[PDB]
Design a binder for this molecule. Structure first.
Ligand SMILES: [Mg+2]
Ligand SMILES: [Mg+2]
Lengths: 223, 223
DNA sequence: ACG
DNA sequence: AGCC
DNA sequence: ACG
DNA sequence: AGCC
């Protein structure tokens, strides 16, 4: 699938931030009304320190049937720095995306979207590139304040940055920690919560798109 | 300082567990009545993957004055496996301990004590070796159930393993995550909570013994 | 789930 | 713990 | 404090 | 994420 190379990836940390502050102004938070059909999930495993393995899984909704799965194994140069995950995992994801045949209605990333220091989490960032609605689903908090939701199956709270709602915390599985959901691009808080709740099956903590992308990222790595 | 080499460290994972199940029966949970004077804190940093740097800091209580500081830089063979931290960080700590001149009244370790699958966290394990009262203070949960304490300076809850109290969770600093305190050897839950509360200064999340051992483990590593 |  |  |  |  195609996309817009909005900028260079070979940037020193301090420069990436500058970029982030410019790209955030181009983000569009908008309702995603309707039932999506093709939903994608993205993730990366790391066979080596400087070697990543990105996987994208396209699912058929509401059947959750796997329709396509592409992957790209490559070098990872940029280090991990909270708030700059995009500059680390972004490039390899895009290379796997160049291999993607079916155009997704929505893409789910294993990371923050709006719930980010500069309001441009890896999900928002990629959305600008691929120009498709995106959602970020992280397994831990990066930014924002919240009241821990009850330990009940669909309990949830809002993630805040002061008075602004930047995402939500959903208990998708009792006994397990909540997940952090936030809009990427062409998405808003209410719609990302609705969609993520619809993409998560009973008994699972992680919504199908990213849950499967992860397993694949791990199976491909190992045997 | 001296200690008892109770067993070999070069053990395969499955064997270490066996050892743990035998050593746990020798643990003595007993009150630590009274004001201690010399309190030690232990920690390790890792200059390389197979290279550790252990530091032990002895403090004067209740002044928190540093009285002694010894360290040992060495190879780390055993990998990290939750529940077997002792087989990884234990050996190098003991080598630093062999260098220790002042005998501590109590030793605080950066890890679990009783709050462990086999009731023998690294703090309990070392206590058997050094035959001195020990306490474990971890920054995250390894085993047990608990109700998150209020976000207030001295708020705390009990850590459970069913009906058994195996430690406590203390909010030592509002806005920061709680710490997990559990008795090692020659210690009990009530006394370890009392002592750890006394060893933690206002505004700090980590009690002085281990807070200082950590900084040193990091400074020595770097410049 | 898990320094 | 270790990738700033 | 922070995949 | 990666050390089973
Ligand atoms: Mg991931
Ligand atoms: Mg430590």
């Amino acid at each position: 699938m195609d996309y817009r190379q909005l900028h260079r990836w070979d940037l020193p940390p301090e420069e990436a931030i500058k970029v982030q502050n410019e790209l955030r102004k181009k983000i569009k938070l908008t309702p995603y009304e309707g039932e999506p059909e093709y939903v994608a999930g993205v993730d990366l495993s790391f066979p080596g320190k400087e070697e990543g393995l990105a996987v994208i899984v396209v699912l058929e909704y509401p059947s959750f049937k796997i329709l396509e799965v592409v992957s790209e194994r490559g070098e990872i140069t940029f280090p991990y720095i909270p708030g700059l995950l995009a500059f680390r995992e972004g490039p390899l994801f895009l290379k796997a995306w160049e291999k993607l045949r079916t155009k997704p209605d929505v893409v789910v990333f294993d990371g923050q979207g709006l719930a980010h220091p500069r309001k441009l989490g890896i999900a928002s960032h990629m959305g600008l590139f691929i120009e498709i609605p995106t959602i970020g689903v992280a397994k831990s908090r990066l930014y924002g304040t919240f009241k821990m939701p009850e330990d009940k199956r669909c309990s949830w709270s809002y993630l805040y940055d002061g008075e602004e709602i930047i995402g939500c915390v959903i208990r998708t599985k009792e006994g397990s920690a909540p997940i952090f959901v936030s809009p990427g691009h062409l998405m808003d808080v209410e719609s990302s919560k609705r969609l993520i709740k619809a993409f998560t099956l009973p008994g699972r903590r992680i919504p199908e798109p990213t849950r499967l992308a992860h397993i694949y990222t791990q199976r491909l790595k190992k045997g």
